[PDB]
């Protein structure tokens, strides 16, 4: 439909790997699998592999996976699409699911091209014996996906990656390797893993002082992977509010201390394995 | 109009590129193509042919693949269809989509068709209290009569496939419609794994200086699709160290790579 | 002049008759009790001036011997016969369904006398509705009246319907009543003596066999159906065909009978 | 023009003494219809409109139709037999326009009224109407709901209907400004049942006299209409004879039979 | 009208805090845009009805003037729609000619449908159109004194699209007032009508219970009328007492034993 002809926004644009930290081995666990078929496919035929098809992520949210989901675009130069696992459903049955056939074919007509898919727990149920009058609809919507990646319809030269914040509840029939041949967990990293992420913001904006991290980051055993971009701007957010438009390591402290407890009052909800 | 497939494509696999499940590699044969090829020999005795079947099991285990080589060896007309597209926006598009496929089969017969998954459109009760979930049942009823109503065909019958085999009506699960059911269990019996590893492995590069029994007897509760992953991943235990042909410890480094995740999920606070 | 297209369903019989319908001889005796009256002394009840019976339902478990009667009965018709398979839910252009049915009789009114047929109106059957469900319930609402109060003086005059379903206890009570129906008759499973006949009859064309007492199998086998037993009659040949002896044996019946249900098979007897 | 074949003119058969013996409502239509037009000045003697419209409650297989079969001669005037299934169209506005015209002939057919059945297609108190289609079905209601009451000066008409269940389906359209009253059929009393059936078999042999008065009982809440079935089931049982001969036991074999299909409850608490 | 910033009470705490989040969208690009750091492109926020959020919204435009045209999602609900969804996308380059004018959308998204599934009907064209009008837009630190935005009923129910929460997440629950606040609000709504001063709202200020801001406007507009309901040009001020309970009327009918 034209809606498939709308999602594709930034199919190429490179935001490379230097702008990331903490994940120097997951990407070593992932630059391995994806690019190689799409760089040097005869190796798996040099050696005799049924090549992979499917990957995902897991770990708590606001952590940097979606960046990785696009950071590979920079390496390839090749194509990409972004899409959720939510804005699919509608009233008319099948119309939600027909789209799935509309799109994998749409991959085949122009590639190297791959797929992303958020929040798949919505399409991530265990097929129940009993049900409501309608919740089985997504289950029949699901299994098309369960089919098309490994169905009777053979496939090659396209890839899917998905992600959740709730690995459980999933139909194991999805988790059959062949439908996705490697997993990974992205955690909240260690302090140093939390430290490159801290400085990349300073790497862009006008720094003024010396390092002054190791004790600042002593507080950094609580944060997520994404509250710090807020923290980074939040320092200059009110370093300037005194009309002092040349930032300091004096003012972030009031910020970085502040965020922790306003984050505390509705934080640490769950972790999902 | 619904579609049909010849030689534009095929699945590009074989009986020889698969192995194990050998008793299922013959029950399927006698139902489908031998009647199509060798007819007289049992029309010597003229019993009605057996017909299309079901085949279930846990997810994977080749529940979906075994078709693919016999499909390559069909010598008749054949399809590429699954279940959850029969539904349509409008009402009568569904049943109208499906009456003609048998006409398409019969217009091209003798032939046979297939489904990759059906449990969405086949349940015990033909539930009643919603304007939607009856219109699926109509898709069930119509084949249930087109299968073995009046004067169906010469063909063999709609080949099922599932992850489960209890949810759905007995009216479909009985002779004249599903004259054979099949299980695909793995069980990790040692009679066959010592082949099918080798089957999957013989096709692919392999160092003849390497262990292989380091894991077979060492692991006993296994499935059929995952195992490709370890001897998929074995290669990936190599090139990370830019090695160009595998080594023995790759499998041992791989043995717990895919399997060993035995049990840690809230052990103490499970029930007590 | 000539009628509408969709009524091609008026058409010849298949190959069947009252030899191949054994066992339930009293049932079939009834289903012509609704047929011999208006024809063999139509003036029996008419010149006795009694009343005129009309169409009927026949139900039961799946695969009990419904349909073959419904077709074989046409073989011995002396009248005209039609067909449906759930196509009445051609619901795009909603009123067309109502158009579809009103045409269905007037044609037969043109061609009366003509017994007619339905099968698995379990699809159409119910009326309990709160927020959604319509778009077909019209078409039950109309046929119910299509037999009454506008044509009812002659609606069910000489048209003599029947109907074949499962699950009589879910659809409307409006329909089963003496209005529009006479006899909610019933097909149970067979008896031990019944099953021998029904095993002896699909057993016809097999072979110049010998050394058989084909009833003790029935004593091996409880009430299952008089429909599945062709099943065990089938693969008995296949099991010998599997080893090429065209000649048969009792040994295979002992086998194939156990083929079906022993694999189609919880000590919490808290009750006494 | 469009409804000339829909325009009934048939002279059906049914009448009183062909009725089974209801009394308690045979009048009340003549109240509804007859006393109005027979002598409408008495309306003025009372100073009123003699009433309009009528709906039948849920009495499936009770006589919810037969009075329409009854009136057809005692009516002594014109009449129509319409029904709701016909209203609905392969196109959009071609339906509701119908209701506007068909009253004109009804205007032309001044001492002419109609029976309707099957209105449960229409009377529906749930109009989310997600589509564009059933919005027309709502449009099929409005003009008629309008055409009914939008018509005043019902000096002659009686626009009436009936069904088998209303208490969960029909709108709150009810208003004496639109529809006045509503009258019920349901299962009979014993002496009510007693009026029913010898009169049927009055046109039938009774080879022997078999004291039917002790045959049935109020405890078995029969339909009103398993009994013509009864009356013919036995001759069917003589259709299971060469003898064309009447017997009580045949009725005995029938009610035992037909009620083997009919429901039965547990007398668990002996309540 | 050009009513003041406040018009609401003594809520200097929020507003004097709030627009500090809008100075950078308003101005300060000298080192901000030389720092290039994040810029909330429309401070969308929340708080259920009852508040003067429209007033806090509109009164903030007292400094950043804005023409009186502010059309919402119920303009975006028609037959074969999309020309309305065209309108929204053109809405800003339209205004981007020369204007610190900024309109104020308003969203009760699933106030027409249900929410039994969290997977929700994040409305069709808003969820689409909101992106381009937000992704490809800057303010230039002059003639874009604020950034167009909206607000909603309850921050639990939304399908956050790309950058729906990426940057534009500046948001506060307006803390409902207290007795020191309240009595000076209802003072405002009597600035046009004077009465017997024998009992201040400060006398009332302990008598209030569970009163949000909007419905308090339904106090003196009636209780000013309940006086002249008995035609006293001298407005009494106990009519509040028997009128405040007219919020729901109490079904007060002949208290038997009480």
């Amino acid at each position: 439909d034209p809606l498939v002809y709308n999602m594709t926004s930034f199919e190429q644009g490179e935001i490379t790997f230097d702008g990331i930290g903490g994940l120097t081995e997951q990407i070593r666990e992932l630059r391995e699998v994806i690019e190689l078929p799409l760089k040097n496919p005869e190796i798996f035929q040099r050696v005799g592999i049924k090549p992979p098809k499917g990957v995902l992520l897991y770990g708590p949210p606001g952590t940097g996976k979606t960046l990785l989901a696009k950071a590979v675009a920079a390496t390839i130069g090749a194509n990409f699409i972004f899409s959720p696992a939510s804005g699919i459903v509608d009233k008319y049955i099948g119309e939600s699911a027909r789209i799935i056939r509309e799109m994998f074919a749409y991959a085949k007509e122009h590639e190297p091209c791959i797929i992303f898919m958020d929040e798949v727990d919505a399409i991530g149920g265990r097929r129940f014996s009993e049900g409501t009058s309608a919740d089985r609809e997504i289950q029949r919507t699901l299994m098309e996906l369960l089919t098309q990646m490994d169905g009777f319809d053979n496939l090659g030269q396209t890839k899917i990656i998905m992600a959740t914040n709730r690995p459980d509840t999933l139909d194991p029939a999805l988790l059959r390797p062949g439908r996705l041949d490697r997993k990974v967990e992205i955690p909240l990293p260690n302090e140093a893993g939390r430290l490159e992420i801290f400085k990349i913001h300073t790497a862009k904006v006008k720094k003024t002082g010396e390092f002054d991290f190791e004790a600042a980051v002593k507080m950094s055993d609580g944060f997520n992977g994404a509250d710090i971009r807020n923290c980074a701007t939040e320092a200059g957010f009110f370093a300037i509010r005194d009309d002092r438009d040349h930032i300091n390591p004096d003012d972030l402290m009031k910020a970085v201390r502040k965020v922790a407890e306003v984050k505390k009052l509705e934080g640490t909800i769950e972790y999902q394995k | 109009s619904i579609s049909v497939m010849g030689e534009n494509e095929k699945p590009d696999v074989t009986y020889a590129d698969v192995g194990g499940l050998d008793m299922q590699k013959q029950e399927i044969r006698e139902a489908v193509e031998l009647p199509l090829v060798q007819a007289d020999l049992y029309e010597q005795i003229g019993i009605d042919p057996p017909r299309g079947v079901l085949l279930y099991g846990p997810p994977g285990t080749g529940k979906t693949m075994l078709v693919k080589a016999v499909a390559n060896s069909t010598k008749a007309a054949f399809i590429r269809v699954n279940g959850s597209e029969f539904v349509h926006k409008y009402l009568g598009e569904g049943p109208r989509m499906v009456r003609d496929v048998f006409r398409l089969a019969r217009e091209n017969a003798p032939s046979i068709i297939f489904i990759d998954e059906v449990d969405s459109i086949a349940t015990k009760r033909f539930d009643a209290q919603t304007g939607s979930d009856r219109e699926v049942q109509r898709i069930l009823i119509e084949l249930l009569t087109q299968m073995d109503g009046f004067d169906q065909s010469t063909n063999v019958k709609v080949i099922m496939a599932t992850n489960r085999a209890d949810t759905l009506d007995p009216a479909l699960l009985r002779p004249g419609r599903l004259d054979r059911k099949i299980e695909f269990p793995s069980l990790r019996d040692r009679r066959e794994r010592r082949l099918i590893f080798g089957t999957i492995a013989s096709k692919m590069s392999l160092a003849p200086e390497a262990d292989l029994d380091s894991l077979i007897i060492r692991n006993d509760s296994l499935s059929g699709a995952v195992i490709a992953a370890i001897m998929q991943e074995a290669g990936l235990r190599a090139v990370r160290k830019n090695r160009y042909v595998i080594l023995q410890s790759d499998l041992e480094e791989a043995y717990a790579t895919q399997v060993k995740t035995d049990n840690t999920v809230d052990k103490f606070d499970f029930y007590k | 002049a000539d009628p509408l297209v969709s009524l091609m369903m008026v058409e010849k019989v298949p190959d069947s008759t009252y030899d191949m319908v054994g066992g339930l001889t009293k049932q079939i005796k009834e289903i012509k009790e609704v047929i011999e009256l208006p024809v063999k002394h139509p003036e029996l009840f008419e010149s006795l001036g009694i009343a005129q019976p009309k169409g009927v339902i026949l139900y039961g478990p799946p695969g009990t011997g419904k349909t073959l009667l419904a077709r074989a009965v046409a073989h011995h018709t002396d009248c005209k016969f039609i067909r449906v398979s759930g196509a009445e839910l051609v619901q795009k252009y909603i009123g067309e369904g109502s158009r579809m049915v009103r045409e269905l009789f007037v044609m037969a009114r043109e061609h009366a006398p003509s017994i007619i047929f339905m099968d698995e109106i379990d699809s159409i059957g119910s009326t309990r509705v709160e927020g959604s469900g319509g778009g077909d319930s019209e078409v039950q609402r109309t046929m119910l009246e299509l037999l009454n109060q506008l044509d009812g003086f002659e609606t069910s005059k000489n048209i003599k319907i029947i109907m074949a379903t499962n699950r009589l206890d879910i659809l409307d009570p409006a329909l089963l009543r003496p209005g529009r129906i006479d006899r909610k008759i019933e097909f149970p499973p067979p008896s031990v003596a019944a099953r021998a006949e029904i095993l002896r009859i699909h057993s016809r064309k097999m072979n110049l066999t010998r050394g058989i007492n084909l009833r003790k199998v029935a004593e091996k086998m409880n009430g299952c159906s008089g429909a599945d037993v062709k099943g065990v009659c089938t693969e008995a040949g296949m099991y010998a065909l599997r080893e090429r002896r065209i000649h048969v044996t009792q040994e295979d019946f002992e086998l194939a009978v156990g083929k079906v249900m022993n694999k189609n098979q919880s000590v919490a007897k808290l009750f006494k | 023009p469009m409804v000339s074949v829909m325009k009934m003119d048939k002279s059906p058969t049914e009448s009183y003494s062909d009725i089974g013996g209801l009394e308690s409502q045979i009048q009340e239509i003549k109240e509804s219809v007859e006393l109005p037009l027979t002598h409408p000045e008495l309306y003025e003697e009372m100073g009123i409109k003699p009433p309009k419209g009528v709906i039948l409650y849920g009495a499936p297989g009770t006589g919810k139709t037969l009075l329409a079969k009854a009136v057809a001669n005692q009516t002594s005037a014109t009449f129509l037999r319409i029904v709701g299934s016909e209203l609905i169209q392969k196109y959009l506005g071609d339906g509701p326009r119908l209701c506007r015209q068909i009253f004109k002939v009804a205007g032309e057919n001044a001492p002419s009224i109609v029976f309707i059945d099957e209105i449960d297609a229409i009377g529906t108190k749930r109009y989310d109407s997600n589509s564009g289609g059933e919005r027309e079905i709502q449009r099929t209601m409005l003009e008629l709901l309008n055409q009914l009451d939008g018509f005043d000066d019902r000096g002659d008409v009686k626009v009436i209907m009936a069904t088998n269940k209303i208490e969960t389906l029909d709108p709150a359209l009810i208003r004496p400004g639109r529809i006045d009253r509503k009258i019920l059929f349901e299962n009979p009393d014993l002496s009510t049942k007693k009026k029913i059936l010898g009169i049927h078999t009055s046109k039938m042999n009774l080879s022997e006299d078999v004291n039917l008065e002790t045959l049935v009982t109020t405890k078995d809440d029969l339909s009103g209409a398993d009994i013509q079935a009864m009356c013919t089931e036995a001759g069917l049982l003589a259709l299971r004879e060469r003898r064309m001969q009447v017997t009580a036991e045949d009725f005995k074999q029938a009610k035992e039979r037909v009620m083997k299909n009919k429901v039965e409850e547990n007398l668990e608490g002996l309540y | 009208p050009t009513e003041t910033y406040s018009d609401v009470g003594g809520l200097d705490k929020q507003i004097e805090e709030l627009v500090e989040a809008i100075v950078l969208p308003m101005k300060r690009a000298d080192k901000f845009k030389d720092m290039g750091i994040r810029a909330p492109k429309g401070a969308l926020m929340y708080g259920p009805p009852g508040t003067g959020k429209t007033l806090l919204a509109r009164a903030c435009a007292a400094q950043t003037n804005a023409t009186f045209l502010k059309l919402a999602a119920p303009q975006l609900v028609q037959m074969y729609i999309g020309e309305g969804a065209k309108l929204v996308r053109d809405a800003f380059a339209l205004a981007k000619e020369k204007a610190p004018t900024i309109i104020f959308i308003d969203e009760l998204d699933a106030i027409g449908t249900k929410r039994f599934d969290s997977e929700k009907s994040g409305d069709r064209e808003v969820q689409r159109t909101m992106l381009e009008l937000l992704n490809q837009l800057d303010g230039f630190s002059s003639d874009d004194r604020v950034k167009v935005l909206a607000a909603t009923n309850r921050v639990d129910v939304l399908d956050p699209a790309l950058l729906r929460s990426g940057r534009l997440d500046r948001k506060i629950e307006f803390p409902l007032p207290s007795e020191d606040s309240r009595a000076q609000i209802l003072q405002i709504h009597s600035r046009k009508m004077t009465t017997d001063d024998d009992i201040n709202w400060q006398e009332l200020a302990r008598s209030t219970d569970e009163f949000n801001g909007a419905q308090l406007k339904a106090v003196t507009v009636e209780a000013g009328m309940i006086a002249l309901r008995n035609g006293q040009s001298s407005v009494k001020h106990e009519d509040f007492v028997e009128g405040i309970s007219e919020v729901q009327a109490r079904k007060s009918k002949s208290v038997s034993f009480y």
Partner: peptide, 12 residues
């Protein structure tokens, strides 16, 4: 027109 009404949908 060149059509009439016909549809189906879920409820929740």
């Amino acid at each position: 027109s060149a059509r009439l009404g016909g549809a189906s949908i879920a409820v929740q």
